[PDB]
mmCIF file of C-alpha atoms in Angstrom:
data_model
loop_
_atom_site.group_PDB
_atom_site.id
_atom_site.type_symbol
_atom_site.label_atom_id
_atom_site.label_comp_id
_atom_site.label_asym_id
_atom_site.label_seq_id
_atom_site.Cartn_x
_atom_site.Cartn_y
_atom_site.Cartn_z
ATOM 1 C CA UNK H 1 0.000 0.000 0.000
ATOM 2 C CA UNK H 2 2.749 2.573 0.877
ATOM 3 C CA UNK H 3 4.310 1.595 -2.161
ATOM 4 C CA UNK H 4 1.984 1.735 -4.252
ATOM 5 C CA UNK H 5 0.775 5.500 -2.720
ATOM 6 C CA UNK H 6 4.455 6.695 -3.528
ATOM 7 C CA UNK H 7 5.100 5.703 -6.556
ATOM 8 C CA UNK H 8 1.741 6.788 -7.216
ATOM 9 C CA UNK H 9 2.748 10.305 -5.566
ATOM 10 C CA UNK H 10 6.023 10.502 -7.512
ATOM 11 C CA UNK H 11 3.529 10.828 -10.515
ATOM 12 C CA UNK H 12 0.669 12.517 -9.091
ATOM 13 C CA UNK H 13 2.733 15.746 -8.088
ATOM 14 C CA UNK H 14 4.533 15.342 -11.400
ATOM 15 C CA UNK H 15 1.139 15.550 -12.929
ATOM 16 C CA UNK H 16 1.117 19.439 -12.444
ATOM 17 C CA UNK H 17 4.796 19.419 -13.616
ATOM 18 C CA UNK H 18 2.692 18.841 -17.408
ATOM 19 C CA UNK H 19 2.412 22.495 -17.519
ATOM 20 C CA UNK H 20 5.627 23.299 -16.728
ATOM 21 C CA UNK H 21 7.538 20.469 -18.594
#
């Protein structure tokens, strides 16, 4: 579960990066 939330995270706070990238 904690694994799967962070390397969920690592993506989901990288989603915003979209605009950025």
């Amino acid at each position: 579960g904690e694994e799967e939330y962070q390397k969920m995270l690592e993506n989901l706070r990288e989603a915003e990066v979209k605009k950025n990238a």
